[PDB]
């Protein structure tokens, strides 16, 4: 090697021996992720070095939980990673694809074809491919009906049949409620609180928020029916002096005026709070709630207090937006003009303790554009897989939301996007129709893996599919309890247009980017 | 050797529980007295 | 031709140190057996006939008790399968209080015929199925099960009687004086009001003359000792202060700045002055007793001490919480005088010695009050610890009664009820199902199995009588551990009784746990550091 | 993890999709390393030992025995193929490849879920069918010197260079028909392959006779004998021994003296009994007499011969007995006790050569040798052992093509007939192991496209080319090395052995099951 000549201590694979390292560590990564697809796949375990447990099936953390160490391995998690970030869903599929097209493409360049050719068939297919999605996509009118039925499809696959049908209403509730029309939807509005002390299906939605803190006073009230919110902004502890005041007196007299006037400045926007709170509710029927971003120490919690006033400090930043939008208030970063019209309005304000953590619950509001998630279940990693699968579910929700297209799931589209190219094939000038014919095998390993988790044979199912396909026109998956055709647009199994898109184009970037590396370096030491 | 493994097994079944292992041992020799008389039993000749 | 290299693929890819198991034998079975073996460790302790276990930690420190929560604590389980397991048994500790050992046993017994299954031909899905489907019938019958209710909590006679069985499991030989004491601590709390704080009982633990001696008082104490002269009161004044009892100084920064002779001459005394005027100035307010939460200065002590002032320091704020509760007083944040309505009342505090520590007592003298403490005495103080969890597992019991008041019946008669009714259920349903309905059934013959042997009797001939017995219409008739022959009788009579929602929350999470394990298909584990305990531990 | 490791913490097992994972991956691997083995247009692969031999090959056997593998699919492979050499001493590289591109394409299938089992099923039945089609394509003929000279071409070509490959092929050839009695099995021992390393590689020759690497030690013996009687014996001309430890014992010098005279008597008695058949023999100066004996000769027995003009030649091989017998006609003599002149062989010129240290001698114009030898001839050590094996392989090639008159079509052509023929017997095999007869066809569909490949021409245009004009015309079309179009190979003259492409379809498909349905590796007997 000529590399070696300059740095000794330097690791090459040059030739075809890149791509057998390349192919490989695809083929690999593919054997692995194969059993995650479909709602049929098989759970997995994964223990960390500290001993910590997770169970998923979620593509993206099973790549990032593995213990690889290998430089394609990582490539393909990259682009699985960014898969997991725009669109949420479809990393498993990412890389089924990414291993099948460098299978197929391995296929004909072990029989002595140049890999140029093939990437310009997987260019020519792709292309073709993305006509033929613009074509097949199904344009609707999101309905509950419509989302519902992609939330199942999503959590479904990701988490137990009943748990997933709990958590559909839940997120499709959620964003339902957070959405405005002809408006992008902001998923930080949805605050994912979890708890760990019932069963996993008592997860459910808030119309409100919940805090994971309670109030630090032992006699404020730990229930108000009517409060009035104040979120603030604004610190109510002992601050130093900028420029190191420091104090001087003479006697022990004097030492008690300047710590009874030291506290003047705090205690003034205590009494302005106060004196507000008099203002808008002369009576003891109404409550009065503030939280507070900043600090409270002891001595306005008991001023407060006093007062029948429901004090929580250090809320997290978020929480700001997220009561504002919900309860309807104003997040104030002072008090210098405060006025009834500042403040937030909850039908209901109550604690709840579990363990040493305590909570907090905003119910009841006139409408809520913020809500919470509550995650309930008897242990951590239960906790963690539903996060993982509400995750993927209000990804796929906004998704069918932000563009009104869908797309048949159980496969249906790649068989017909597959048999579609095979068709345009003969139209693909020189040698490219290898490249089409192998980017098609790869896009036909949605419906094998399907069939393989579901228990029946590929070949037997696959071709059953086609026939049906063939002879029909329509768009047939596979069902995942006969193994027969079966249309997915009739019962309801809907895939995301934008998961498509993105799937092709990234999976076609990220192969024929590899099958043009002819060299793996390593001289930088 | 997989006959041996079976009977093994379904004999920790019982070890698992307050029996004596003497008790499974002739109940085993008892079904292998069983055994082979049934074997005798539904066995056919042959003209060699 | 002399080495087997590892496959191309994921197994070269895996790292040094990471191990991958896949398939049934590599994982489903492992983790079967791994549950299995822990099982059999926790059976032992199981019911009155259960043997205590020295158990001793990292840090040697010993733990001898029966109780399955704290034995799987202190243990240093590393299977993750038994991780779940161990999880499910703190859950339903954290839930209802009592029944972890259920938890183990019952789980146990899932997976170790949920492996039968599997060997027979059944696949991993229609286990899971028929477990579920078992678990909803058992749900469904439990409520029908219910043979009496609690039907009043404020009595002493029959509180005691229900919280005997709680507390019969562990301290088998003498539960009727823990049942009394108990039922006496809970009973002082527990107001007209349904709600009932556990955290309200208090076990103060004072080692030296046997747990025979052991007593409840409506009050607190505390193993301190008085800072001032006096050290008894009778018709006590607390005034509870959370400031140091000191004359409060600047948080910024003091500095006493001195210009003149005569600021030099006068600065000390006039704030000796200053202290004295404040003591005095509690002191008018009829308050005899103060309790403070930081350091007592020196001239305070002296001008306190002028004045007959008993000064109790409490370092803890939790305690300083929990004395204002009891004596229903404010912790005021400053040392101004106590208003009326601030100022605490207890019928008397006083020091004390029990045994050889010294104690301050503020003890009631009327059958009510916020707290109530339990003081505990013994020989050693493992055996006390061992009474300190009876007492907690007591505490829990009146708990749950309080929140549902159904019983069913002990001893194993409600689960070979529900084994019965489950496996008469299952002999109905067609499919596959079915057998994993059965197994699920039979399962729940490892609690009355557990508490025969630990008796040491026959399992086989007692669950054979209970069935035949079950059989006849009896529904509340279960293992008699006072006989050295298999032998049964019926528990309502014996009021051996166990809360219904104990063996609902029980049965519920061992068999999500059973499934969550047996979901499991897969295990990549990592390599396992030698890092200093996870950041979120600390 | 698995029971075996359970058992044996220091257990190596590969299981399930693991084994057939790491057999093909070798399979392919020891394929890959052996593609540019084939054909005429190869590649020399250079080979340093450890000790620092080089040592220059195409062979395939030669170059796996030098390949630095320890892997046990590998070493089973190795073992087929030595077997392949063994017996027929052609087609080891045709052999890996098949089963390589075997392995390949059974797995192309088996990674969509298919069973191994039905992969196998569809390789038996496309064996049979093949072996039928071979029946029915090969060239019965009567093979005159022409046909061996194509065939023994078609090997050297493939081993050696050009030239020397042409040379060669005489050479070979006519040894092969000057040992070939008629009716009769060929015995290779007959063919002495000697080596000399003075002389260029196309020296390289066949000396209708026999040589020697030894040479008369006496160095007043006669150097050329013109007209030669031959007398092979196996009689020790040396001093022996006494079995029984005898010992001497005597009393005075004199008597020393005599004992010493008198010790050597037995040894006289044969020396003098050689001088009197020699007398008898030939009378005058004209003819000499070399006797070949495969026992020493001390030195005073040679003095004693050199005194009569006789050369002889001491410690010979045990194969050169028989090879004296038939190439000069006399016999072999395990006692003089009762020897005649009918015991004589006959050799028309005997003459010593030199090279170097070392000695040889040359019996030739014998009048009907039924044993020849072939002189292997070259500047270097490498050389010599190329040429050697190039020599074994043309040997071997012409003796399996005289054992059967028939003859097969080279250049690929029978592969791609019978896969042909077995696309079309596809349809009529009943279940899913039409599967694994196409495998099974596109494996032996392998020799043209590495053909090809070698030749460097486009593999999938040159294979469909060849598959068209085969199917368009229905004759026996192969591949043309030097300009990829298809070419008759019988007409042309590229013919393979019959017996050799009937073993590579056996042993191929033989060990491809066997492999095929390995489910477990397991090396669990240490401790
Ligand atoms: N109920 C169903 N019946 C048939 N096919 C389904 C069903 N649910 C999902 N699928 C198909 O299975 C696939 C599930 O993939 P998934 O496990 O979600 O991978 P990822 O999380 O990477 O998207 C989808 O592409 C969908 O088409
Ligand atoms: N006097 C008794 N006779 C027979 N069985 C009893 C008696 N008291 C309690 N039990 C049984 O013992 C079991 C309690 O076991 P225990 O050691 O408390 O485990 P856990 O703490 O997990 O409940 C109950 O199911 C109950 O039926
Ligand atoms: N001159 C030629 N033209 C075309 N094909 C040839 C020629 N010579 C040999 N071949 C083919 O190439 C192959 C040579 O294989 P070879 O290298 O001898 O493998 P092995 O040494 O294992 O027998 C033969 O099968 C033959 O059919
Ligand atoms: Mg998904
Ligand atoms: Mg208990
Ligand atoms: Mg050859």
Request: aromatic residues 4%; charged residues 25%; glycine residues 8%.
């Amino acid at each position: 090697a000529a590399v070696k000549t300059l740095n000794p201590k330097a690791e090459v694979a040059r030739a075809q021996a890149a791509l057998a390292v390349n192919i490989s560590a695809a083929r690999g990564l593919q054997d692995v992720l194969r059993t995650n697809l479909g709602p049929k796949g098989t759970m997995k375990m994964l223990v960390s070095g500290a001993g910590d447990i997770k169970l998923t099936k979620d593509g993206n953390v099973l790549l990032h939980e593995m213990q690889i160490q290998h430089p394609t391995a990582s490539l393909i998690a990259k682009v699985a990673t960014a898969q997991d970030d725009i669109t949420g869903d479809g990393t498993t599929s990412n890389v089924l694809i990414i291993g099948e097209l460098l299978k197929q493409a391995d296929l004909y360049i072990s029989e002595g074809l140049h890999p140029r050719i093939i990437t310009e068939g997987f260019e020519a297919a792709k292309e073709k491919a993305l006509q033929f999605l613009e074509e097949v996509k199904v344009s609707r009118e999101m309905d509950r009906e419509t989302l519902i039925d992609v939330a199942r499809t999503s959590l479904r696959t990701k988490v137990h049949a009943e748990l997933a049908d709990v958590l559909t209403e839940a997120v499709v509730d959620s964003i339902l409620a957070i959405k405005k029309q002809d408006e992008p939807i902001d998923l930080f509005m949805i605050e994912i609180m979890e708890m760990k002390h019932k069963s996993e299906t008592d997860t459910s939605l808030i119309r409100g928020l919940v805090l994971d803190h309670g109030a630090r006073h032992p006699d404020m009230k730990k229930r108000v029916e009517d409060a009035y919110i104040l979120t603030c902004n604004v610190s109510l502890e002992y601050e130093k002096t900028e420029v190191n005041s420091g104090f001087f007196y003479k006697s022990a007299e004097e030492r008690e005026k300047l710590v009874k006037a030291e506290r003047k400045f705090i205690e003034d926007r205590v009494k302005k709070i106060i004196e507000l709170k008099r203002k808008v509710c002369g009576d003891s029927d109404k409550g009065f709630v503030v939280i507070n971003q900043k600090g409270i120490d002891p001595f306005s919690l008991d001023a407060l207090s006093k007062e029948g006033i429901v004090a929580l400090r250090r809320a997290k930043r978020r929480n700001m937006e997220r009561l504002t939008l919900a309860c309807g208030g104003v997040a104030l970063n002072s008090f210098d003009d405060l006025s009834p019209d500042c403040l937030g309005h909850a039908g209901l304000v109550y604690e709840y303790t579990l363990g040493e953590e305590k909570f907090t619950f905003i119910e009841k509001c006139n409408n809520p554009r913020s809500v919470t998630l509550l995650i309930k279940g008897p242990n951590k990693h239960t906790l963690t897989q539903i996060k993982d699968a509400v995750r993927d579910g209000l990804r796929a929700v906004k998704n069918a939301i932000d563009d009104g297209c869908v797309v048949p799931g159980a496969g249906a589209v790649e068989v017909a996007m597959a048999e579609a190219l095979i068709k345009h094939k003969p139209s693909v000038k020189g040698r490219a129709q290898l490249g089409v014919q192998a980017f098609a095998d790869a896009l036909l390993i949605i419906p094998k893996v399907l069939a393989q988790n579901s228990g029946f044979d590929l070949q037997e199912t696959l071709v059953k599919i086609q026939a049906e396909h063939s002879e029909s026109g329509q768009l047939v998956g596979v069902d995942l309890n006969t193994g027969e055709p079966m249309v997915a647009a009739e019962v309801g199994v809907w895939d995301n247009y934008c998961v498509k898109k993105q799937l092709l184009h990234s999976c076609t970037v990220i192969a024929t980017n590899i099958l043009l590396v002819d060299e793996i370096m390593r001289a930088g030491m | 050797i997989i006959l041996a493994g079976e009977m093994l097994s379904v004999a920790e079944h019982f070890l698992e529980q307050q029996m004596h292992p003497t008790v499974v041992i002739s109940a085993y020799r008892k079904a292998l007295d069983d055994m082979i008389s049934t074997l005798k039993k539904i066995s056919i000749p042959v003209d060699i | 031709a002399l080495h087997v290299p590892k496959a191309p693929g994921f197994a070269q890819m895996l790292k040094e140190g990471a191990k991958h198991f896949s398939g049934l034998e590599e994982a489903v079975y492992r983790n079967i057996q791994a549950c299995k073996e822990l099982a059999q460790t926790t059976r032992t302790a199981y019911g009155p006939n259960g043997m205590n276990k020295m158990v001793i930690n990292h840090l040697e420190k010993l733990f001898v008790t029966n109780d399955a929560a704290t034995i799987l604590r202190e243990l240093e389980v590393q299977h993750p399968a038994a991780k779940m397991i161990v999880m499910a048994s703190h859950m339903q500790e954290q839930e209802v209080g009592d029944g972890t050992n259920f938890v183990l046993v019952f789980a146990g017994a899932l997976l170790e015929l949920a492996e039968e299954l599997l060997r027979i031909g059944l696949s991993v899905s229609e286990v899971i199925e028929g477990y579920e489907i078992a678990c909803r019938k058992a749900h469904e019958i439990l409520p029908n099960l219910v043979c009496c209710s609690a039907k009043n909590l404020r009595d002493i006679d029959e509180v005691s009687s229900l919280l005997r069985t709680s507390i019969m499991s562990k301290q088998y030989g003498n539960e009727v004086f823990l049942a009394k004491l108990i039922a006496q601590a809970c009973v002082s709390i527990f107001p007209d009001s349904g709600h009932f704080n556990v955290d309200n009982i208090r076990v103060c633990k004072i080692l030296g003359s046997g747990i025979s001696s052991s007593s409840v008082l409506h009050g607190m104490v505390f193993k301190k000792e008085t800072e001032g002269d006096v050290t008894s009161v009778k018709d006590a004044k607390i005034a509870v202060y959370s400031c140091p009892f000191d004359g409060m100084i600047t948080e910024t920064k003091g500095t006493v700045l001195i210009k003149t002779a005569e600021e030099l001459m006068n600065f000390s005394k006039g704030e000796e002055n200053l202290m004295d005027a404040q003591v005095k100035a509690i002191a008018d307010t009829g308050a005899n007793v103060v309790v403070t939460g930081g350091k007592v200065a020196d001239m305070a002590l002296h001008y306190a001490n002028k004045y007959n002032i008993m000064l109790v320091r409490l370092n803890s704020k939790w305690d300083l919480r929990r004395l204002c509760k009891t004596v229903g007083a404010t912790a005021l944040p400053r040392l101004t005088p106590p208003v009326l309505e601030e100022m605490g009342h207890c019928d008397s505090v006083y020091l004390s010695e029990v045994g050889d520590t010294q104690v301050v007592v503020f003890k009631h003298e009327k059958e009510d009050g916020a707290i109530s403490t339990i003081v505990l005495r013994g020989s050693t103080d493992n055996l006390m610890d061992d009474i300190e969890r009876a007492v907690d597992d007591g505490v829990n019991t009146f708990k749950v009664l309080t929140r549902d008041k159904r019983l069913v019946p002990g001893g194993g008669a409600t689960e070979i009820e529900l084994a019965k009714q489950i496996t008469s259920y299952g002999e109905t349903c067609p499919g596959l199902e079915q057998y994993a309905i059965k197994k699920f059934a039979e399962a729940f013959e490892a609690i009355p199995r557990a508490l025969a042997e630990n008796s040491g009797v026959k399992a086989n001939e007692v669950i054979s009588k209970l069935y035949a017995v079950h059989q006849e219409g009896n529904k509340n008739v279960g293992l008699d551990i006072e006989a050295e022959v298999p032998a049964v009788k019926d528990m309502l009579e014996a009021g051996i009784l166990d809360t219904y929602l104990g063996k609902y929350w029980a049965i519920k999470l061992a068999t999500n746990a059973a499934v969550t394990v047996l979901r499991v298909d897969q295990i990549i584990m990592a390599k396992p550091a030698g890092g200093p305990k996870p950041p979120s531990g600390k």
